[PDB]
Amino acid sequence: KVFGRCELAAAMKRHGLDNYRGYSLGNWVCAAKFESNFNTQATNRNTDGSTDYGILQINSRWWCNDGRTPGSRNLCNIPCSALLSSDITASVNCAKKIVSDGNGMNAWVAWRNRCKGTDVQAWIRGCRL
Ligand SMILES: [Cl-]
Ligand SMILES: [Cl-]
Ligand SMILES: [Cl-]
Ligand SMILES: [Cl-]
Ligand SMILES: [Cl-]
Ligand code: NA
């Protein structure tokens, strides 16, 4: 599923991501835009052989099991395929664990490089929330 900007903002809010660990909803929408272009089915292979999955490009090295990332962990206790669902519950729950891990949203390289320190509220501006 390819979410619209306000539609994703609404879903993220429903699943309790708005101000989670202090990150306003625009941070989450901005990160999703640059990680996946709002597409739940996005997958991208990394040089190390791990793969990133879903709307927030969660990586198989640490967070989910895809059967093909040697030495990896599955700290969200889910198959990486669960992260590609049209329903974002699994992605949200896993992102809550990731952003709690110590480095906040810096875990998401696209957030650090394209969202951090910008006007992230623009990503939610205009939305009925
Ligand atoms: Cl957009
Ligand atoms: Cl915001
Ligand atoms: Cl594996
Ligand atoms: Cl599994
Ligand atoms: Cl933080
Ligand atoms: Na894994």
Swiss-Prot record:
GO terms for molecular function: beta-N-acetylglucosaminidase activity; identical protein binding; lysozyme activity. It is an enzyme of class 3 (hydrolase). Keywords: Allergen, Antimicrobial, Bacteriolytic enzyme, Disulfide bond, Glycosidase, Hydrolase, Secreted, Signal. Its main location: secreted. SUPFAM superfamilies: Lysozyme-like. Substrate binds at D101. GO terms for biological process: cell wall macromolecule catabolic process; defense response to bacterium; defense response to Gram-negative bacterium; defense response to Gram-positive bacterium; killing of cells of another organism. It catalyses: Hydrolysis of (1->4)-beta-linkages between N-acetylmuramic acid and N-acetyl-D-glucosamine residues in a peptidoglycan and between N-acetyl-D-glucosamine residues in chitodextrins. GO terms for cellular component: cytoplasm; endoplasmic reticulum; extracellular space. InterPro entries: Glyco_hydro_22, Glyco_hydro_22_CS, Glyco_hydro_22_lys, Lysozyme-like_dom_sf. The keyword Nucleotidyltransferase does not apply. Its EC number is 3.2.1.17. It holds the Pfam family Lys. It is found in: Secreted. Transmembrane segments: none annotated. Belongs to the glycosyl hydrolase 22 family. Lysozymes have primarily a bacteriolytic function; those in tissues and body fluids are associated with the monocyte-macrophage system and enhance the activity of immunoagents. Has bacteriolytic activity against M.luteus. This is Lysozyme C. It comes from Gallus gallus (Chicken). The lineage of its organism: Eukaryota, Metazoa, Chordata, Craniata, Vertebrata.
